[PDB]
Design an enzyme around this catalytic site. Structure first.
Site, PDB file in Angstrom:
ATOM      1  N   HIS A  21       0.985  -1.107  -0.044  1.00  0.00           N
ATOM      2  CA  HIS A  21       0.480   0.156  -0.248  1.00  0.00           C
ATOM      3  C   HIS A  21       0.747   1.456  -0.199  1.00  0.00           C
ATOM      4  CE1 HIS A  21      -3.606   2.620   0.776  1.00  0.00           C
ATOM      5  NE2 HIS A  21      -3.644   1.928   0.483  1.00  0.00           N
ATOM      6  N   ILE A  31       1.527   4.626   1.637  1.00  0.00           N
ATOM      7  CA  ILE A  31       0.607   5.532   1.715  1.00  0.00           C
ATOM      8  C   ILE A  31      -0.196   4.807   2.830  1.00  0.00           C
ATOM      9  CG2 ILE A  31      -1.288   6.799   1.092  1.00  0.00           C
ATOM     10  CD1 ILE A  31      -0.536   6.764  -0.808  1.00  0.00           C
ATOM     11  N   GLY A  84      -6.134   4.661   4.639  1.00  0.00           N
ATOM     12  CA  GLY A  84      -7.233   5.203   5.473  1.00  0.00           C
ATOM     13  C   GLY A  84      -7.622   4.337   6.079  1.00  0.00           C
ATOM     14  N   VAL A  85      -8.405   3.409   5.777  1.00  0.00           N
ATOM     15  CA  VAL A  85      -8.728   2.277   7.185  1.00  0.00           C
ATOM     16  C   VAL A  85      -8.327   1.687   8.263  1.00  0.00           C
ATOM     17  CG1 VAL A  85     -10.336   1.405   5.032  1.00  0.00           C
ATOM     18  CG2 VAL A  85      -8.366   0.055   6.118  1.00  0.00           C
ATOM     19  N   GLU A 115      -9.394   2.622  12.195  1.00  0.00           N
ATOM     20  CA  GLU A 115      -9.198   0.978  13.253  1.00  0.00           C
ATOM     21  C   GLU A 115      -8.208   1.926  14.024  1.00  0.00           C
ATOM     22  OE1 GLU A 115      -9.995  -1.570  13.495  1.00  0.00           O
ATOM     23  OE2 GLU A 115      -8.919  -2.383  14.996  1.00  0.00           O
TER      24      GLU A 115
HETATM   25 CL   LIG Z   1      -6.105   4.982   2.074  1.00  0.00          CL
END
Ligand SMILES: [Cl-]
Ligand SMILES: O=c1c(O)c(-c2ccc(O)c(O)c2)oc2cc(O)cc(O)c12
Ligand SMILES: O=c1c(O)c(-c2ccc(O)c(O)c2)oc2cc(O)cc(O)c12
Ligand SMILES: [Cl-]
Ligand SMILES: [Cl-]
Ligand SMILES: [Cl-]
Ligand SMILES: [Cl-]
Ligand SMILES: [Cl-]
Lengths: 151, 150, 152, 152, 149, 147
Positions: F48, F54, F57-58, F62
């Site tokens: 990622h 990066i 986002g998830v 969390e």
């Molecule tokens: Cl992301």
């Protein structure tokens, strides 16, 4: 095409291990809908931490898999099946809304993603739908992602 | 019981990540047969190297998952669902014969192990059968194990 | 074609990568006939996290895998010599395994020696048989048939 | 007090675990004097994914770490013998490292042999020095001072 | 200032052995200030140690080495990815290492290295590792820059 | 402050899904400020993305949920490792999340969560994730604590 296998996914999506969370696409309608899935096995590294003695596929990773399904739909709707255009693209989450988890996902589950395009404008795709196991809804989500050329 | 989930498998087999290769047991007939399965997903570390750009579930790990299902069948035949006795037992696999691979296994496959007791004499368990995906035979193997004390 | 090959060479011939490249070095090689290779066994392998906790035992099926990869290296070089450009377009498939015996457990600190001879070969299909040895003792025996195929 | 120890025994004395347990076997041990131990080096180690792609080299600092761990095992067993109960309550913490030299790169297929000897000891403070060897060739040298500390 | 993407173009180190996240300062032939973030989400902490996460001292030293090598390389050739692939920075010696304070998840591990001396392709660097203004470690290191094949 | 040692005694999450390194502020039934360091040396960055690290986002979300979990646990039972060890945490809902700035290696990812509503084991929180004083993400979430 309507059906795509892991080789096809690897050629379109930029995600790689341990973050490629779609195994197979069963149906695809350009600009409209996608149905895909990820197999859930104990043999995944996430299960070491989530949780010891109680393996539960993280809810946020379900949402991630839904996003990657929308991203596959997004790209092929834009450029078709074109790996050479794909290899320099990235996908950013912009928003997430209205997610509800109903049933825990565990090793042995076939996690089926059902996304429908709610609104798209160029690179910005808004998809919503469900994750399913044995025909039952385990999760609902609405999300917005952007396709971007890597720089 | 007839169906066992990952929670129950973890209490019988000593195998842990990344070598626990049975996710769920769907059928169990003491002294006769087991039907179990492992889900195959790209999100497994083995696929990093087997092979780059061509994810193929190793044939030897199919055989391994078949051995783990045979072992679960053997143990449960002797003691049933007993996590406390499970800790005191070892299942030593001695031989593997007559294994054939017909169809490659890939991410997205539900790998189903079908094993039957071929022979049981004392501590020695001889088991054999198939691995199947979507009703088709992808592999076959025969295996022999010994029950012993930990 | 030399008789000794190191990890850098194996890397250029075999398509296997971490955590499924299970041959570290080739010590002896005879085109179309035999190969002696080895893999070092260390606690520092991820596989030992689950096989088993507080009791590291190298999985028997992975010993068979290491013997196959040794056989595959013999197969590629017999066919094309040391040719990374052709090797790169190929993968290896297991077809059969037979007559496997596990005599002695393999543990961290063991030097797992693979001894394989060609039993039969025609084109891409190679049948090999032999033993895995640790300190001159037979730890396992196996026979296997593999095929070299275009990765397409 | 034995002079040979296997991975089962090393686990009972050292607190280090995957991916930081870097000693596989002890071949020689003389209390208060010396230890000869080793770690097998294999391609099947996560460290080689990043050090380096297409050229696996065992990190020099990890050689030093393995020497320290051998040193720590020697220190503890010199004072308590093979005592798993007390080992679990103690931790060897290194205070200093000096005169490190890297002579030869360590690669998959190597048997990395640690030779440590006690230069000075008084109570919990242990000063050891020696070499890492492959095929009887010095691949590294180091000196280090350790502290047998309380775990809690 | 250099970010992870720049670091990746200069150093051949990759996961799990790239131990510099960002470079905040760099004076050619003189000094570097760089850092690595320490998080629980690192594989090292599984074994170092269970129930007590401590960033290994040898890896602190590796991070200082990687920083020192970045300084020596960019001093000579600047930010040049092309030449970077043609060169090897190998560490010959390490000396005068002292560990003062344990480094744990949540720490910003800051590397301060200066060029002590250099002649040709042999570069002797030294300095400290720091967390929140305190010296947690110190070391001297000598590198040779060579042609990669 | 609560350090990683204390975090491990409360939260059930382990590697590679424990995404809080330190708790800097705690106010029972009100708010929590916590953080996670972002380094290149994390397995997620392998996928990622390759050549562009990066932080997902998830996983920001969390990390915020785990922060809110720590607030929930302690507001309920105080710092009690004995009770905590019997529990796990389930995500129930996520809503109104927006990502503004990508999170990369070298960032200190700071979580700010206040309680919006709570009843028994069910806790609704919301807030932001910040890097260097700047809001990089917003989120609201509801979690459940379970035996
Ligand atoms: Cl992301
Ligand atoms: O399959 C099994 C197995 O391999 C071992 C095992 C344990 C320790 C060893 O040293 C060893 O060689 C094997 O234990 C088992 C115990 C069970 O209750 C069931 C099993 O199926 C196995
Ligand atoms: O970084 C490298 C390195 O440290 C060594 C090395 C390791 C240990 C030694 O004792 C030694 O003298 C050299 O070799 C290398 C060879 C390469 O092709 C590339 C490298 O980057 C290194
Ligand atoms: Cl969850
Ligand atoms: Cl195979
Ligand atoms: Cl085995
Ligand atoms: Cl090195
Ligand atoms: Cl340390």
């Amino acid at each position: 095409q309507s059906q795509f296998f892991i080789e096809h996914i690897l050629q379109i999506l930029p995600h790689r291990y341990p973050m490629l969370l779609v195994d197979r696409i069963t149906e695809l309608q350009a600009n409209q809908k996608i149905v895909a899935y990820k197999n859930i096995t104990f043999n995944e590294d996430v299960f070491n931490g989530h949780f010891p003695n109680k393996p539960i596929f993280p809810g946020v990773l379900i949402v991630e898999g839904m996003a990657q399904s929308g991203g596959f739909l997004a790209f092929t709707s834009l450029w078709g099946f074109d790996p050479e255009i794909a290899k320099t693209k990235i996908v950013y989450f912009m928003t997430i809304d209205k997610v509800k988890f109903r049933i825990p996902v565990t090793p042995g589950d076939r996690l089926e993603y059902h996304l429908e395009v709610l609104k798209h404008k160029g690179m910005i795709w808004q998809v919503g739908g469900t994750a399913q196991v044995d025909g039952k809804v385990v999760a609902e989500a609405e999300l917005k992602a952007m396709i971007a050329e890597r720089e």
